[PDB]
Amino acid sequence: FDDIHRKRMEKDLNELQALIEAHFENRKKEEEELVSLKDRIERRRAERAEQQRIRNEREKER
Amino acid sequence: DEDETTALVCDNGSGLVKAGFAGDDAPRAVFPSIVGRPRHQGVMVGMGQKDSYVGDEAQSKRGILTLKYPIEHGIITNWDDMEKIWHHTFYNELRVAPEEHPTLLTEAPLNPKANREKMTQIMFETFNVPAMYVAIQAVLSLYASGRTTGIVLDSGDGVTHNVPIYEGYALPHAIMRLDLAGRDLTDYLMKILTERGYSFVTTAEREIVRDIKEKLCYVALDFENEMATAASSSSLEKSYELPDGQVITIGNERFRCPETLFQPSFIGMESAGIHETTYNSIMKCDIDIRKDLYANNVMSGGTTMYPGIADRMQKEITALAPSTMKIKIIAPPERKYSVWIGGSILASLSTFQQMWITKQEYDEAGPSIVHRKCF
Amino acid sequence: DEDETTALVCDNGSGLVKAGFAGDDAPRAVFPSIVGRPRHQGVMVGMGQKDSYVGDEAQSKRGILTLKYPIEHGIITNWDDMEKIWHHTFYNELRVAPEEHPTLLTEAPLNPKANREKMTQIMFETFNVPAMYVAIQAVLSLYASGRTTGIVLDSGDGVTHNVPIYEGYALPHAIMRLDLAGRDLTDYLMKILTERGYSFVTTAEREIVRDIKEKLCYVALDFENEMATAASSSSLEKSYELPDGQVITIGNERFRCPETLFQPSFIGMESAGIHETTYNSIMKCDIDIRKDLYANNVMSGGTTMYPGIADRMQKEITALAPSTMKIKIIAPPERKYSVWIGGSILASLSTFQQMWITKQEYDEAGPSIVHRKCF
Amino acid sequence: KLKEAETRAEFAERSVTKLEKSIDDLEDELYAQKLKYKAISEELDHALNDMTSI
Amino acid sequence: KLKEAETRAEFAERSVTKLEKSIDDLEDELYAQKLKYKAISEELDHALNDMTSI
Amino acid sequence: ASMDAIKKKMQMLKLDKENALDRAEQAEADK
Amino acid sequence: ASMDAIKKKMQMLKLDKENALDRAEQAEADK
Amino acid sequence: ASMDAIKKKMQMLKLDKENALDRAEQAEADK
Ligand SMILES: Nc1ncnc2c1ncn2[C@@H]1O[C@H](COP(=O)(O)OP(=O)(O)O)[C@@H](O)[C@H]1O
Numbered sequence A: 001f002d003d004i005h006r007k008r009m010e011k012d013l014n015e016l017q018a019l020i021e022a023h024f025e026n027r028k029k030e031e032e033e034l035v036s037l038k039d040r041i042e043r044r045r046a047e048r049a050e051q052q053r054i055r056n057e058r059e060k061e062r
Numbered sequence B, C: 001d002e003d004e005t006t007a008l009v010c011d012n013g014s015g016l017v018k019a020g021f022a023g024d025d026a027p028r029a030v031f032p033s034i035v036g037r038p039r040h041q042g043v044m045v046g047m048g049q050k051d052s053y054v055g056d057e058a059q060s061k062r063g064i065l066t067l068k069y070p071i072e073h074g075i076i077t078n079w080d081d082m083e084k085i086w087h088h089t090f091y092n093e094l095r096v097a098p099e100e101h102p103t104l105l106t107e108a109p110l111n112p113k114a115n116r117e118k119m120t121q122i123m124f125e126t127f128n129v130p131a132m133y134v135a136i137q138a139v140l141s142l143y144a145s146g147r148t149t150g151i152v153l154d155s156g157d158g159v160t161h162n163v164p165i166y167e168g169y170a171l172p173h174a175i176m177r178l179d180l181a182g183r184d185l186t187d188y189l190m191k192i193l194t195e196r197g198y199s200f201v202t203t204a205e206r207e208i209v210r211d212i213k214e215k216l217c218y219v220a221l222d223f224e225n226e227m228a229t230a231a232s233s234s235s236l237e238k239s240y241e242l243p244d245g246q247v248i249t250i251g252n253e254r255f256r257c258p259e260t261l262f263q264p265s266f267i268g269m270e271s272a273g274i275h276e277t278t279y280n281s282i283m284k285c286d287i288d289i290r291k292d293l294y295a296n297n298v299m300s301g302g303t304t305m306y307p308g309i310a311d312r313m314q315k316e317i318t319a320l321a322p323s324t325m326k327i328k329i330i331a332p333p334e335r336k337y338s339v340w341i342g343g344s345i346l347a348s349l350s351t352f353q354q355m356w357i358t359k360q361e362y363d364e365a366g367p368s369i370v371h372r373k374c375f
Numbered sequence D, E: 001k002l003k004e005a006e007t008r009a010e011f012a013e014r015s016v017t018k019l020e021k022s023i024d025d026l027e028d029e030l031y032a033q034k035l036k037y038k039a040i041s042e043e044l045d046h047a048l049n050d051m052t053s054i
Numbered sequence F, G, H: 001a002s003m004d005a006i007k008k009k010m011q012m013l014k015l016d017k018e019n020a021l022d023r024a025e026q027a028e029a030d031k
């Protein structure tokens, strides 16, 4: 019986460390990859938006 | 998905249903004990729409549904709705059809026999389960917590049972069953939030208050002192975000609701509270039993997860108990989730295989058999 | 003009303002809780013209005014318009001045505390009343009807309260505050009269509909049968003459509106009706209480004056209630104005003269004092 | 039709450059949130692994 | 000129539609940033305010 | 990340100190 | 960047455990 | 004149007969 309790602590603490790591790392990987990716998407969209604004001004003159 | 005929295990309360399979140490899914039904006339054509929604469906579509709970004060009053809950609970999420697997359902020790008889009948005649067992919730809590001895407080949404068990034996003369529960605490909060200018009267509103309680409320180690400051200053207030972007700010009501557990008079209940209920069960047991029950106040069921409750219950019993004696509460983080886990433990014990009612004995005797076989 | 410092008594609701002095058996005057304002640009010079009109002035000049009611389903929000209503009530009707008289105001038991605090603040700070007392409408409803035990069914313009009282004690856990009232019936009738080809959307139109309802409506003992004949024949129709000479003929709308009290779904409300709330408020009380509450369901407020309402609720409660036991509705002629009478009874009791907030305690503590001094 | 189309060409293009701008002004301010809410929360969680090393 | 103005109006309408979609997506992303940020900052303020005894 | 590390370390230390303390108290109290 | 509550109490509760553990061994040896 | 005489006589008789009937029923029902 008390071995059940020990097994529970063994899995919970192995899980705790796996989880402190997975909780943090899954977010740091997904989250930093996401902002890095979307920081670039945001910049590329802003660049394209500026280019289209310029393109629209050029057509207006045409 | 399963490679053995493991029993399926559910703890069906007046609040929520916890479910998973025998042999695990945790439920795999939780559903509210809710079946929802539309209260409006359809105008558009071809938008689907069910006659009723179950569990999480009932809450997700709740904007126009009235939401009913099939279980009240520990028993099933509406079993047609429980059949939909069980199909969803056992087959849609756990992916196991009971037809090929035994099922364990739970009850309080004094739970009306009619409820254990219907639980047995339904799983055998509607789900064709090969075997059944209806378990005592107190037994299950003690297994999960690693105890054979203690007072089990199953203080959930329906009823507080309060049963002493010693060396695996029931001590029924010392049971202090009390009609004081989490559903009443919610009703009280709805009324005191009404006093603050936020009336809640519809299903959507009722579900909001239950959400406010679960996220903001606590019992407090010392209620009257906590109230003296909370009722006097904004420094103990906490806000909650309502579904439409509006907010509610709550002060002493934050703990006055949970306090009804210790002061039942707040809801018109004739009771001195859950700590005297616990104490009297210890008091009524034999003198060489009492020492082990004072050292083992066991926490299961809902409300056991309010801040200050584990420390408050040990303090309140200590205050009633004789000096010299050590009063201890069994209240680990895995507190309350002990009843589902025990269902898994019991279902899978080798010493409990003979306790399963098979769908042999069941048809020869009928559902009244559960009263003769489960305990 | 009074020769004694008798308390002033006034029920300032979402509908009507009832007022008189303590010790009488009726309000001396009753008028709507209305402050009106011009919705047009003036063109003639030397025409007088107020920025705002009060009570009967607001209705008399309503052709160019938008009319507002400061009390919203039982609570005061527009305290500035209510100061004008009180000043008019006291000085232009009763010919009294609160400065020389203690004043009693009343609210439902689950009315937000803000109402009692604001009423207390204004009467002490703008009218300089020597004392104040905010009474419970349920208390006053039973005093007027002659009961210490019963259910207060106060079904008026603002909110239906549904509270059981036993031997002078509240049984608050059984209060069923319901968002179903005479105010909703006025708006619902405007919508079903629109269905008949007579659209009503403006203040003048709302006041016309409130008059149609008050003079033509009833509920009936058997709704479906009354509906079947009203929907089939002119023999159950009744005409109404509008202020501008138009005539509207009304059929089953005459009762379909009022029927919302028993079928709240007609206005989109999640409710089983006023008879079920009465029933459940009793069923949640102890069995040695229920025997007295079922025999004493007591009407107060408007809508209780509709033909078939006492018989309709008694029939439904009786149908839901157990046999042997007797179920009865008390529905005295002192209807709709009985809470005022109860105010007179309370204000004049010798046992009540210690319940007043004086204008000493008030300034030392501020208006929040009402929350501790009245009940 | 040309005046309407030209007016609409202007309004639609205006809506395009208005939205490209509100979007940039959205996204740019949004990326600030995007880059700092996750980095603050991320570094908070990073720090938590270490904050909790006691 | 009309076909060109209609091209511009429709170009821009198609483009504004895409931009409107970008806003709808952007706002959902924004909400995710705010909601996750809020959830993280608050789950920590509360986790640390209640979990103070270790 | 809510303090998951703490939630479990908290349970570990409260339980371990309470058990160690219960042992300290009994070890002397037994006389 | 530890939160003081967690750093200070994790160490103090850890110490209550260690001190109690040693006290249990010590007192048990005496008793 | 609306039937004022009736409105009150109606209340008087309904109440008096209901009370008398309640008494008749109890007088026998009490056994
Ligand atoms: N942390 C918590 N805070 C406030 N109330 C709680 C908490 N946990 C559970 N409760 C309350 O307990 C009730 C749940 O009943 P429960 O005993 O868990 O059924 P079951 O026996 O299947 O577990 C609900 O009213 C819920 O609001």
Ligand SMILES: Nc1ncnc2c1ncn2[C@@H]1O[C@H](COP(=O)(O)OP(=O)(O)O)[C@@H](O)[C@H]1O
Pocket (backbone or CB within 6 Å): C011, C013, C014, C015, C016, C137, C154, C155, C156, C157, C158, C182, C183, C210, C213, C214, C215, C300, C301, C302, C303, C304, C305, C306, C336, C337, C339
């Ligand atoms: N002939 C009538 N039949 C039914 N109800 C009426 C009649 N005349 C007036 N009333 C209603 O009385 C209501 C006034 O509210 P009231 O009941 O006096 O406040 P309170 O609930 O505090 O007692 C209005 O909704 C009005 O329409």
